Amino acid sequence: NKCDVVVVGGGISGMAAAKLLHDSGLNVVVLEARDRVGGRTYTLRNQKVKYVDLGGSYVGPTQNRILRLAKELGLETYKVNEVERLIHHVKGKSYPFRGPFPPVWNPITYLDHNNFWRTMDDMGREIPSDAPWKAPLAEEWDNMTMKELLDKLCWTESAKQLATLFVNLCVTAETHEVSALWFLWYVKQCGGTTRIISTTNGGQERKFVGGSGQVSERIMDLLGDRVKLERPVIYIDQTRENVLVETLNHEMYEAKYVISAIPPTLGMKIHFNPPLPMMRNQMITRVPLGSVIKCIVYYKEPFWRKKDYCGTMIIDGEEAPVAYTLDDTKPEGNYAAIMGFILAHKARKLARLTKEERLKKLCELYAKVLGSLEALEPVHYEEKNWCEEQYSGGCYTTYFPPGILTQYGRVLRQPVDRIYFAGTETATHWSGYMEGAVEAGERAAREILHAMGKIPEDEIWQSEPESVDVPAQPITTTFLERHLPSVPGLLRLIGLTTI
Amino acid sequence: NKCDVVVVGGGISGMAAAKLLHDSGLNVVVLEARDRVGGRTYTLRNQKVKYVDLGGSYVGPTQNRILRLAKELGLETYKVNEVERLIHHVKGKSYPFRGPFPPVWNPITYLDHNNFWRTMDDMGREIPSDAPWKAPLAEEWDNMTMKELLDKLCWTESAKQLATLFVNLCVTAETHEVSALWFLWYVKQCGGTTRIISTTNGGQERKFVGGSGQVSERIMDLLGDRVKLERPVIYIDQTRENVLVETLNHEMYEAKYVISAIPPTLGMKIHFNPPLPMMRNQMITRVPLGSVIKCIVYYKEPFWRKKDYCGTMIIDGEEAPVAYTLDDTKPEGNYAAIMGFILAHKARKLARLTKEERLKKLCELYAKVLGSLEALEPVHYEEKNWCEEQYSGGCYTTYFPPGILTQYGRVLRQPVDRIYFAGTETATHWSGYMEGAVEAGERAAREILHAMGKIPEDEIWQSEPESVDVPAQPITTTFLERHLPSVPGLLRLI
Ligand SMILES: *Cc1cc2c(cc1C)nc1c(=O)[nH]c(=O)nc-1n2C[C@H](O)[C@H](O)[C@H](O)COP(=O)(O)OP(=O)(O)OC[C@H]1O[C@@H](n2cnc3c(N)ncnc32)[C@H](O)[C@@H]1O
Ligand SMILES: *Cc1cc2c(cc1C)nc1c(=O)[nH]c(=O)nc-1n2C[C@H](O)[C@H](O)[C@H](O)COP(=O)(O)OP(=O)(O)OC[C@H]1O[C@@H](n2cnc3c(N)ncnc32)[C@H](O)[C@@H]1O
Ligand SMILES: CCCCCCCCCCCC[N+](C)(C)CCCS(=O)(=O)O
Ligand SMILES: CCCCCCCCCCCC[N+](C)(C)CCCS(=O)(=O)O
Ligand SMILES: c1ccc2oc(-c3ncc[nH]3)cc2c1
Ligand SMILES: c1ccc2oc(-c3ncc[nH]3)cc2c1
């Protein structure tokens, strides 16, 4: 009933906010719609898999907040398998490789690929992490889709196809669905193209031993009965001295302040009194989440390793249900498994099938890509289609269609009276990830501490010491990567020698 | 508590559905979130204006359902003034004209403009009104914005600027916000470019005497205490024998079936048990409504008529707050007024001003465009910013960003167990309009009558006889309009 702060949502962001407030001596309550905490993280436990992350799983260098929070809760990481070769499967054939990107041998195609990644990062440097609408060409870039930008930048079909797969995997959406400004912001605020796509030295380097759901569960353990499960919030009333928060199961909570720690569009599920200001009222109808089915196929052994494949497959082509896989074998070497994502329109297309039908298509694909009949012999299968979740809306995160980020982006984390906004979507570093959820939950909690006169303004945003366990190597380029011309740059050089 | 059908939403579509079900002898209840009926229609009455439509207002030929429904309820229409010349204001100068499109004189610009409109209608012919995702090029057209299509089709800036104004005024959204397939469908399902943009013989021909809010109000009068105001629906449970519908003010309604007659995205405000199917769960997060402030400036007389201007202005350019106006004077020549729309990004930009600051900007604009100091002497002002409305989400209607109509369009009308979907967004003719609200509410009602075994399947969708009061005249084209080449066409012959 009565408290200092109600936190709406018990995902990592709400849990990190509640913990900070609790540790600071305030009385907090977390109102969580589901019968569990964790939100877009979910660790399933059963005897066939031991444990498996069906939602968010990976962490890596530069994600220092989630690493610190998880360490403090007694959790450990291990490295995703990348010992053996990666595979790029394109036009029905597999090409093994090492390094962040498949090698390109054709010199023209090489210039085009090099220029594409370079230009993504060059554009990103123009876009402030905390205010992307302030980029010099924000309007021009927000008024085109990523499809339009790829059409302009890629002088080869090879580059355009790889770039397409890159966008679909990063943000679980099609290139024509998303704003170019927003996508360029999203990549830059994860540290750039190499950092976002990499396993070793990148976002996919590690997983938590025992699953990421432990982060939210262990914070629930610390907070005790302060976390109220099966309490979907339906109504927030700020017309009186204390804020009133009502739940679906007929309970009323009264607080000094509220943190909204849910995906922005899911604010639609709450009726507000007084009504939200115009810009937020419309913003929350303009910000969908992406579409993904996360699928894990189990085998007797990690047989791909014997063929010198690590289990990472980048798979192009419309017929392939899964465009990206990673080895999901336990660190002990047992419960061998391949994790794959069914992305964007394919999540919609293939949701029609049964579980058994999707397992069959995945095994047939993996058998072809790995050149291995053993892939047709799974021992177990788990999957989760995040598009079906009422209290998530999709995964991994919210995308912005053309025109929205410049017109409505300013209000995403703007307080509304005594409501402050957390959730990974409001982060400025690794927004969309477990890391961004921690950044945003703690920042929102500190906004409230500042409102209460407990901390000064300069303490609202707080830097994070680098993890000693997962240090980050710098992202570097070569002289030739920096200075080689693009294809039109080369054509201009050719024109000039002729003139 | 108990009834045959609960209708969620008391706009025109919910009211038309509830009236049809009531007239067939079912017990209906309408649950309306607001303290009023009418939704995206709203008629304000006061002594200064008598009455004024601050939401949807115009009706015209081919909109036979809304005309028949209003006539039955005792309403009359009058014609929007279009006796004198229209104005196109471009690069700071007014050019008066007659007919529905402004004249173009330069021969290259002429071919470009002619080809733009012609091509919009040619593309529309391949898009089924009841299934735009079945167009032969559905995916190609859905994956581009209208901005990308205009960049391809328009070889002149003049055409691109007017086409941009056209998109902004039709769907209160920017060309780069909307799918080309969806926008092309939207125009075709209103009868094409001439029909949607025209006052005489088009969508804006008429208004209702006393205001369009009277349609919802008079159905509420018929239904009496069956209409429950200040009952926002929060929860719908379909796990039991009868459907259970819960409101924010802690009431529970039990029915055999439910009609959802709210904008699609506003289904987000309801918690569902069991959860919605995947495709609808995601669809209702992908379908925003547009942005508009409707503004009405009143004057002592309709002074523009003395200069042989009817009050219609098409005003190009970024600086102008209002890109389109119509004369809003009453049929008797009194309560002289100009109605203008502040569209799309300008609604967002100018919402930060005060009401008095917006009034000054509009009057100065109108003084320039009408070439009249009389425009600087307003006697009254009313406006409504629809972006502020929790229970509308915007106006006039829902738009589809690129990629969404092909991936999710099929779900809009699909029943979910015993919930059927009305609302103008689900119509197949004049979706977005009061006409579409009536088509969809009556079709959803007849889906339920069919589920109850009261009518056969072939009576779910019903034709509408043409209005005797507002007959349609044919849309025609000239030989030259049909056959003049495009710009790249003339370049092939060169
Ligand atoms: C789904 C997914 C996500 C994901 C990913 C793969 C998939 C399939 N891969 C990731 C990865 O490897 N590494 C990483 O860091 N992130 C990746 N993600 C994204 C990650 O899971 C999310 O960024 C993160 O979990 C988001 O956390 P946040 O706390 O911001 O949001 P949430 O988890 O959605 O939590 C919101 C909670 O709110 C409850 N809710 C919703 N509505 C209400 C109402 N009305 N009332 C009360 N509670 C509400 C939700 O139930 C949820 O618990
Ligand atoms: C806003 C606007 C609309 C408009 C226009 C100009 C403006 C500024 N110009 C028009 C015109 O000249 N001619 C025309 O035919 N239409 C034009 N429009 C659009 C027109 O107003 C709309 O197409 C039509 O009114 C839509 O009717 P519909 O019945 O489909 O939808 P609605 O009016 O939005 O009604 C929905 C009702 O539902 C209530 N609601 C919302 N959520 C809930 C919940 N959770 N529970 C219960 N009730 C709910 C809303 O309050 C509303 O009354
Ligand atoms: C007789 C000589 C004519 C040769 C002129 C060549 C025509 C150039 C067309 C190639 C388009 C390439 N893409 C990548 C699709 C678009 C680039 C965008 S941008 O042009 O760089 O702005
Ligand atoms: C001897 C040199 C001849 C000069 C010819 C120059 C022509 C360049 C202008 C083309 C741009 C026109 N837009 C409308 C933007 C694109 C058309 C779309 S599409 O080309 O039909 O795809
Ligand atoms: C496009 C789409 C998916 C991709 O995954 C990588 C990658 N995985 C591990 C190192 N680089 C690179 C890459 C490029
Ligand atoms: C672009 C934008 C707005 C427009 O309004 C008309 C119009 N109004 C009455 C007859 N034609 C034509 C037109 C073209």
Q: Which two tokens stand for residue B209?
A: 């005497």
The enclosing H or E element of A150 equals: helix A146-153
DSSP at A458? G
Q: Is residue B72, in this structure, part of any structural domain at all?
A: yes
A272 and A410 belong to one structural domain: yes
Return the number of other C-beta atoms located less than 10 Å from residue B247's C-beta: 19
| A390/B contact by beta carbon, under 8 A | yes
Residues of chain A neighbouring B393 (CB-CB closer than 8 A)? 281-282, 285
For residue B306, how many C-alpha atoms fall within 13 Å in the half-sphere facing its CB? 7
Do residues A433 and A334 share a domain?
A: no
Residue A240 located in a structural domain: yes
The number of C-beta contacts closer than 8 angstroms across A and B is: 130
Q: Per the structure block, which two tokens stand in for A276? A: 């939200």
CATH of the domain at A125: 1.10.405.10
Q: How far is A361 from chain B (nearest CA, A)?
A: 21
Q: Which residue in the set A177, A270, A286 is minimally distant from B403, CB to CB?
A: A177
- In order of A116, A444, B91, the CA distances from B10 in angstroms are 53, 39, 44
Q: Cα dist. A182→A131, A433, B85 in Å?
A: 11, 16, 45
Nearest to B469 by CA among B142, B2, B72, B26: B72
> What is the C-alpha separation between A481 and A99, in angstroms, rounded?
15
Assigned domain for B450 exists: yes
Do residues B218 and B85 make contact, with C-beta atoms less than 8 angstroms apart?
Answer: no
Using alpha carbons, select from A324, A313, A317 the residue that is nearest to residue A369: A313
Tokens 């967004």 identify what position?
B425
Using DSSP, state whether A183 is helix, strand or coil: helix
Question: For residue A390, is it within any domain?
Answer: yes
Beta strands of A411-467 (E only): which ranges? 419-421
| Angle ∠(B194,B199,B205) on CA atoms, nearest 5 | 120
A407 shares a domain with A356: no
- Answer yes or no: is the C-beta of A340 below 6 A from any ligand 5 atom: no
CATH number at residue A451: 3.50.50.60
Contacts for A496 with CB less than 8 Å, ≥ 6 apart: none
Angstrom resolution of this structure: 1.6
CB of B39 sitting under 6 A from ligand 2:
yes
Q: Which residue of B has its CA nearest to A269?
A: B269
CA of B73 to the centre of ligand 6 (A): 31
- A297 in Cβ contact with A378 (< 8 Å): yes
- CB-CB neighbours of A226 under 10 Å: 16
Record: contact B401-A291, CB cut-off 8 A = no
All residues at 6 or more sequence positions from B331 whose CB lies less than 8 Å from its CB, including other chains: B78, B79, B209
Asked whether the beta carbons of B231 and B249 are under 8 A apart, the reply is yes
Residues β-bridged to residue B206: B59, B79
Cα A287–Cα B281–Cα B424 angle in degrees, nearest 5: 80
Query: Which tokens belong to A178?
Result: 């998303």
Query: Measured between beta carbons, which residues in chain A are less than 8 angstroms from residue B287?
Result: 285
Q: What is the CATH number for B319?
A: 3.90.660.10
Look at residues B400, B423, B447 and tell me which one is the last residue of a structural domain: B400
Provide the domain count of chain A. 3
Q: Would you list the DSSP string of A22-76?
A: HHTT--EEEE-SSSSSBTT--EE--TTTS-EESS--EE-TT-HHHHHHHHHTT--
Show the tokens assigned to A418.
């005594």
Tokens for B22, please give them: 């009531």
Residues 6+ apart with CB under 8 A from B319: none
Q: Which distant-in-sequence residues (6+ apart) come within 8 Å of A495 by Cβ?
A: none
Q: Are A109 and A340 in contact (CB under 8 A)?
A: no
- Atom 9 in ligand 5: which residue has the minimum CA distance? A198
Q: Which of B286, B352, B385, B425 to mutate to test the interface with A (most CBs of A within 10 A)?
A: B286
Q: How many CB atoms lie within 10 A of CB A280?
A: 19
Shared-domain flag, residues B219 and B366 = no
Q: Which of B272, B387, B407 sits opposite A282 (nearest CB)?
A: B387
Does B482 fall in a domain?
no
* DSSP per-residue codes, A390-405: TTT-SSS-B---TTHH
Partner residue opposite A271 with nearest CB, options B232, B287, B394: B232
- Burial annotation B80-93 (CB, 10 A radius, 16+ → b, else e): bbbebbbbbbbeee
For residues B12 and B437, the answer to whether their CB atoms sit within 8 Å is yes
Put simply, whether B328 touches A (Cβ < 8 Å) is no
**Residues of chain A numbered 166-185 and touching chain B (CB < 8 Å):** 174, 176-177
Question: Measured between alpha carbons, how far is A160 from A314 in angstroms, rounded to an integer?
Answer: 15
Regarding whether A323 and A280 lie in a shared domain, the answer is no
Give domain status of residue A497, yes or no: no
Q: Give B268's contacts in chain A (Cβ within 8 Å).
A: 265-266, 268-269, 285
- Look at chain B and count its residues: 494
Query: Is B238 at the interface with chain A, CB within 8 A?
Result: no
- In three-state secondary structure terms, A177 is coil
Q: Is residue A481 part of a domain?
A: no
Contact A200, A310 (CB under 8 A): no
- Between CA B33 and CA B492 the distance in angstroms is 59
Q: Is B387 on the interface with A (CB under 8 A)?
A: yes
DSSP A303: G
Q: How many residues does the structure list for chain A?
A: 499
Find the residues whose C-beta lies inside 6 A of ligand 6.
B 86, 100-101, 162, 165-166, 169, 197-199, 312, 314, 324
Give dist(CA B317, CA B304) in Å, integer. Answer: 22
Q: Which of B144, B174, B407 sits opposite A403 (nearest CB)?
A: B174
**Pair of tokens at residue B333:** 């020549």
Residue B400 to residue B180: CA distance in whole angstroms: 9
Q: Tell me the HSE value of A122 on the side-chain side, using a 13 A CA sphere.
A: 11
- CB-CB neighbours of A450 under 10 Å: 15
- The distance in angstroms from the start CA to the end CA of chain B is 75
Given the CA of residue A102, which atom of ligand 5 is nearest to it? Answer: 12
Do B203 and B342 lie in a common domain?
Answer: yes
Nearest-angstrom CA–CA distance, B321 and A360: 58
Q: Does B249 touch chain A (CB under 8 A)?
A: no
Last residue of a domain, one of B400, B418, B448: B400
Q: Which domain holds residue B241?
A: 1-39+61-76+209-287+401-461
B458 burial level (CB within 10 Å; 0-12, 13-18, 19+): exposed
Question: Taking phi first (over 0 means left), then psi (-120 to 50 degrees means alpha), and beta for anything else, what does residue A135 get?
Answer: beta
Cβ neighbour number for residue B471 with a 10 Å cutoff = 11
> 3-state class of A414 per DSSP?
coil
A221/A276 same-domain check: yes
Q: Is A429 helix (H, G, I), strand (E, B) or coil?
A: coil
| Binary contact (A281, B387; C-beta < 8 A) | yes
Q: What is the 3-state secondary structure (H, E, C) of chain B?
A: CECCEEEECCEHHHHHHHHHHHHCCCCEEEECCCCCCECCCCEEEECCCEEEECCCCEECCCCHHHHHHHHHCCCCEEECCCCCEEEEEECCEEEEECCCCCCCCCHHHHHHHHHHHHHHHHHHCCCCCCCHHHCCCHHHHHCCEHHHHHHHHCCCHHHHHHHHHHHHHHHCCCCCCCEHHHHHHHHHCCCCHHHHHCCCCCCCCEEECCCCHHHHHHHHHHHHHHEECCCCEEEEECCCCCEEEEECCCCEEEECEEEECCCHHHHHHCEEECCCCHHHHHHCCCCCECCEEEEEEECCCCHHHHHCEEEEEEECCCCCCCCEEEECCCCCCCCCEEEEEEECHHHHHHCCCCHHHHHHHHHHHHHHHHCCHHHHCCCEEEEEEHHHCCCCCCCCCECCCCCHHHHHHHHCCCCECCEEECCHHHCCCCCCCHHHHHHHHHHHHHHHHHHCCCCCHHHCCCCCCCCCCCCCCCCCCCHHHHHCCCHHHHHHCC
- Pick among B230, B265, B278 to test the A interface (most A CBs inside 10 A): B278
Look at phi and psi of residue A57 and say left if phi exceeds 0, alpha if psi is from -120 to 50, else beta: alpha
How far apart CA A366 and CA A369 sit, in angstroms, is: 5
Residue B393 in contact with ligand 2 by CB distance below 6 A = no
Compute the C-alpha angle B331/B333/B337, nearest 5°.
Answer: 95
**Contact call for residues B385 and B351 (beta carbons, < 8 A):** yes
d(CA A391, CA B281): 10
Please classify residue A168 by burial: count the beta carbons closer than 10 Å to its beta carbon, then call 0-12 exposed, 13-18 middle and 19+ buried: buried
Residue whose C-alpha is closest to residue A205's, from A79, A333, A330 = A79
Cβ pair A272:B390 closer than 8 A: yes
Q: CA-CA-CA-CA torsion for A420, A421, A422, A426, nearest 10 degrees?
A: -140
Task: Select from A145, A147, A151, A358 the residue whose CB has the most chain B CBs within 10 Å, as the one to mutate to test that interface.
Answer: A145
Across the interface, whether the CB atoms of A288 and B268 are under 8 A apart is answered no
Residue contact A176–B143, C-beta within 8 A: yes
**Torsion angle, CA of B45/B48/B54/B59, rounded to 10 degrees?**
80
The values of phi and psi at residue A353, to 5°, are: -70, 165
CA distance A22 to A4: 10
Residue A391: inside a domain: yes
* Residue B116 CB–ligand 4 contact under 6 Å: no
Cβ distance of A388 and B291 shorter than 8 Å = no
Last residue of a domain, one of B400, B416, B437: B400
Nearest of A36, A2, A28 to residue A229 by alpha carbon: A36
Q: Do B279 and A148 touch (CB under 8 A)?
A: no
Q: Which helix (H) or strand (E) holds A365?
A: helix A355-370
Residues 6+ apart with CB under 8 A from A327: A80, A81, A302, A304, A305, A310, A311, A312, A337, A338, A339
User: Residues with Cβ < 8 Å from A318, sequence gap 6 or more?
Assistant: none
CB A408 within 8 A of CB A283: yes
A216 contacts A230 by C-beta, under 8 angstroms? no
8 Å CB contact between B40 and B32: no
- From chain B, pick out residues whose CB is under 8 angstroms from the CB of A269: 268-269, 271
Residue A79 near residue A205 (C-beta atoms within 8 A): yes
Task: Report CA-CA distances (Å) from A10 to A19, A430, B438.
Answer: 11, 19, 43
A426 contacts B197 by C-beta, under 8 angstroms: no
Which residue is it, tokens 């003139």?
Answer: A499
> Are residues B327 and B202 part of one domain?
yes
Q: Name the residue with tokens 């000039």.
A: A496
Cβ contacts of B276 on chain A, cutoff 8 Å: 390
- CB contact B248 to A (< 8 Å): yes
Q: Are B190 and B430 in contact (CB under 8 A)?
A: yes
Nearest CA in chain A to B273: A390
Same domain, B168 and B273: no
Classify A463 as helix, strand or coil: coil
Contact call for B143 and A288, based on CB within 8 A: no
Residues B170 and B276 occupy one common structural domain: no
CA A34 to CA A248: how far, in whole Å? 12
Q: Which two tokens stand for residue A482?
A: 């920096």
Residues B128 and B182 in one domain: yes
Residues near ligand 3 with C-beta < 6 Å? A 151-152, 155, 488
- Which of these, B7, B2, B50, B53, lies nearest to B30 by C-alpha position? B7
What is the B136 CA–ligand 4 centroid distance (Å)?
A: 26
A226 and A345, same structural domain?
no
